[PDB]
RNA sequence: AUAAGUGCUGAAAGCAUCUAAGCAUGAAGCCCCCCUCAAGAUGAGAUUUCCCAUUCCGCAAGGAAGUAAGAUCCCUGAAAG
RNA sequence: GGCACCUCGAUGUCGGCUCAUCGCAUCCUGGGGCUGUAGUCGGUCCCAAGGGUUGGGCUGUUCGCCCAUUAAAGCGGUACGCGAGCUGGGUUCAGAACGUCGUGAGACAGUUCGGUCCCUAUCCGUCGCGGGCGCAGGAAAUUUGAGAGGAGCUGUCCUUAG
């Protein structure tokens, strides 16, 4: 993942989902995989 | 622009029957699937014709209004033809086989991996590369595919291991 | 799951078709039977008693005499309980003999082990002693009884008292051999108890 | 110079089915009828309450995410002795004592409150001993 | 049964998505299985078996005084202390 | 460190020994995501406190360096846990000496050598063992388990297979 509390997005595929409660980038590049925590 | 406006036709080889409270069971010469459904969304039946409707227009009933319909969607859809995933699996010394019902894959380990589709669920081993897991819910059918696939999931750098048909497997150049 | 309730005599040692030695325990069995055969039906668990040895007339009572002369053997020292047992092959007044067990097979073994007394906290729980020399006065004690912002000792502060005397297992015992006609097994290894005291022989939970 | 009753108490039985109910409002209307505050007899300190019995506490049901994160929460005298129960662990394993805890705690502490405690006989599924008695059916109020 | 994680179905939001519903995996951790204690568990439980429902009072409740099965005092001791 | 709120009709102060327990901001082991991760090894991160977490040299030392192991040699709470449990090396009494300061008696977070560690446990609290009564008759045995404690660590070698 990157669990950091400034989560967003890097690129233009980048997507933002607020999945089970927590704020995730999830995109096609896994080092943009992204979670808040 | 939305799903659960349009409507769903139901020509032929497809006879869904309400039977019980909010439980659809559609009928057919593959299989036949029942489903409970939430007692908000409303289904009427028109001649041929299941019709969704939604109380209100609210954040949940317009999930429900999504997801009630395009279940039903395909459980016609697969009462009618049914569904298959299809598993290439690529390697040097890697191979799939069939004893009975029970899928052998001697894929990369130094043991059988034995899988059991136990619910009915007919897996082809057309050629020694590929499975297909053929049956009537996209549920239970790419459930078993992805079962598949977890036996193996691809590396990067050689695509090997389990992979689905059209998959973009991630390559990497390690050098 | 079968088994049966002895008494120990001593060790001995055994060559094994080999030159091996093997520490052997000798557990007498004079051979038990079926005492009262509970059910589910009423007392919620399916179990059974089996009784060992044979008392004098004199040391029994008239209860004793009732509860045993359902199934008239005599009545008997050791009564204890087999849980889970094969509930179709045991009927009352069986006379559950050593002929069951073989060389074989895999052996849990409960008896009660030997007493020690009010013994320190090194001899019962294992704890080590302060210094006997360079000044100190602190040895053969059991240690600081804990901090001081709870107020108090915790529970579990390990202490003298009497040591002995619990019942114990040793798991996965293996048996040497079987002397039915003088209903003796004999146990690789060591078993709890001091001589002449009753020892029940399961088969292990493997 | 009210009356003050007391050996002059007659205990009704009462059966509260909790097949739907959440247990915080259920027991709040029983664990006040234990005690007889429903009876215009009350005496504070001679137990003026009348017998209580729940059946189906197995079906008692709540609100929210509380079956996974209500937890109780059980320390023994013993270091590093706490021990926890999620709401559905105590849910799906022994409703009663679930049903019970929350009566204990809603039941006024002292001497008489264990006894007012002792009234209460809560039972899973309906098998009810308890045919000796005629346990009347009663209803809560919301 | 889960935690991290990985997923199916899958909308909201013609798509996409481990999502609100529905489902599934997944740790030396949690609950058991394993060993010990444990009904003073005052919620004091349950089995099998033994003894039987006597003698006076007093107008009753109740009291006392022999006992039954059983146990204990005292004694011989150790495997127990 | 600031402040001086409790204690100067006394709250013994470091290190070690014994005995632990707790937190997780996890040292190993367990499960993982990312990689500038080919493999073996790694880096970082996420979840996880269940268990484990060495023996010496010098030093009073905690700490630190070093030797040799380990799977790892984790950080911190508990009056920098624990002296009515122990030691007394160091601090912090009276002797004496050095350097230095002071005219001086003497003084030094300067050094050095030597220096009285008292207490029969009342209560709680722990660890064990009994005696009473209860348990709606009195007894002898066998028990169910609510609940509670324990245990819970891990290497290397072969095979898969060079
Ligand atoms: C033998 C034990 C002595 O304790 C200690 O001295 C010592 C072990 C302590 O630690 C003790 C507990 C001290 O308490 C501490 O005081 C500190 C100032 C404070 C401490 N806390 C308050 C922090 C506190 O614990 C104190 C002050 O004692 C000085 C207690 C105080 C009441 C005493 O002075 C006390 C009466 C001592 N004393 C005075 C004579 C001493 C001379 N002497 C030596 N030997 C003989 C002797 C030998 C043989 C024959 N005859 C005589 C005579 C005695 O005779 O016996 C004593 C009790």
Redesign the pocket.
């Known amino acids: 993942?990157?669990?950091r509390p400034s989560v967003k997005p890097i690129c233009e595929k980048c997507?933002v989902?607020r999945?089970?409660?927590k704020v995730m980038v999830?995109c096609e590049?896994?080092?943009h995989?992204q979670?808040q925590? | 622009?939305?799903?659960?406006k349009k409507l769903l036709e139901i020509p032929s080889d497809v006879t869904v029957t309400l039977n019980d409270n909010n439980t659809v069971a559609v009928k057919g010469p593959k299989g036949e699937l029942t489903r409970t459904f939430?007692p908000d969304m409303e289904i009427k039946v028109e001649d041929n014709v299941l019709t969704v409707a939604r109380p209100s227009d609210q954040?949940?009933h317009?999930?429900?209004?999504?997801?009630?319909r395009?279940?039903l969607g395909?459980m016609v859809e697969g009462v009618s033809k049914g569904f298959e995933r299809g598993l290439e699996l690529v390697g040097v010394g890697y191979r799939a086989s069939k004893s009975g019902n029970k899928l052998v894959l001697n894929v990369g380990y130094?043991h059988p991996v034995e899988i059991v589709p136990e619910e009915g669920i007919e897996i082809e081993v057309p050629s020694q590369t590929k499975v297909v897991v053929k049956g009537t819910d996209?549920?239970?059918?790419?459930?078993i595919?992805?079962?598949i696939?977890?036996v193996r999931?691809p590396?990067?750098?050689?695509g090997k291991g389990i992979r689905y048909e059209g998959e973009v497997v991630?390559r990497?150049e390690?050098? | 799951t079968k088994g049966i309730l002895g008494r120990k005599i001593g060790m001995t040692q055994v060559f094994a078709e080999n030159g091996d030695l093997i520490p052997v325990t000798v557990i007498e069995a004079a051979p038990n039977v079926v005492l009262?055969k509970?059910t589910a039906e009423?007392?919620?668990?399916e179990?059974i008693?089996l009784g060992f040895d044979d008392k004098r007339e004199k040391l029994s009572?008239?209860?004793?005499?009732?509860?045993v002369a359902?199934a008239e053997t005599a009545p008997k020292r050791?009564?204890?309980?087999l849980?889970g047992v094969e509930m179709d092959a045991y009927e009352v007044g069986q006379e559950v003999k050593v002929e069951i067990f073989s060389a074989g097979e895999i052996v849990?073994v409960?008896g009660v082990?030997?007493?020690?007394?009010?013994q320190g906290?090194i001899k019962r729980?294992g704890?080590?002693?302060?210094?006997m020399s360079?000044?100190?006065?602190?040895h053969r004690?059991?240690?600081?009884?804990?901090?001081?912002?709870?107020?108090?000792?915790?529970?579990?502060?390990?202490?003298?008292?009497?040591?002995?005397?619990?019942?114990?297992?040793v798991?996965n015992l293996e048996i040497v051999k079987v002397d039915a006609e003088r209903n003796l097994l004999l146990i690789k290894g060591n078993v709890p108890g001091?001589?002449?005291?009753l020892i029940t022989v399961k088969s292990a939970?493997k | 110079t009210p009356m003050a009753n007391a050996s002059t108490i007659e205990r009704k039985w009462l059966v509260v089915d909790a097949a739907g109910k959440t247990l915080g409002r259920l027991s709040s209307e029983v664990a006040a009828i234990l005690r007889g505050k429903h009876k215009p007899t009350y005496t504070p300190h001679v137990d003026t309450g009348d017998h209580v019995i729940i059946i189906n506490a197995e079906k008692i049901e709540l609100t929210g995410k509380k079956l996974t994160d209500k937890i109780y929460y059980?320390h023994?005298?013993?270091?590093?002795?706490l021990?926890?129960?999620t709401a559905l662990?105590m849910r799906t394993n022994y409703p009663?004592?679930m049903l019970?805890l929350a009566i204990?705690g809603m039941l006024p502490k002292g001497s008489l409150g264990?006894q007012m405690?002792?009234k209460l006989?809560?039972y899973r599924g309906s098998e009810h001993p308890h045919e000796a008695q005629k346990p009347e059916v009663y209803e809560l109020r919301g």
């Open positions: 993942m990157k669990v997507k989902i999945r089970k409660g999830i590049n896994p080092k995989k979670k925590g | 622009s939305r799903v659960g939430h954040k949940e317009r999930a429900l209004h999504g997801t009630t395009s279940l395909n130094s996209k549920e239970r059918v790419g459930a595919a992805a079962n696939r977890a999931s590396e990067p750098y050689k991630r990497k390690g050098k | 009262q509970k009423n007392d919620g668990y179990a008693q009572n008239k209860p004793e005499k009732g509860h359902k050791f009564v204890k309980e849980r849990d409960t082990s030997k007493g020690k007394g009010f906290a729980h704890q080590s002693r302060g210094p360079h000044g100190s006065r602190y004690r059991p240690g600081s009884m804990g901090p001081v912002d709870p107020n108090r000792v915790f529970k579990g502060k390990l202490l003298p008292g009497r040591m002995g005397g619990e019942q114990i297992t798991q001091a001589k002449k005291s939970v | 059980r023994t005298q013993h270091p590093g002795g021990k926890s129960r662990e009663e004592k019970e204990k264990r405690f002792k006989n809560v």
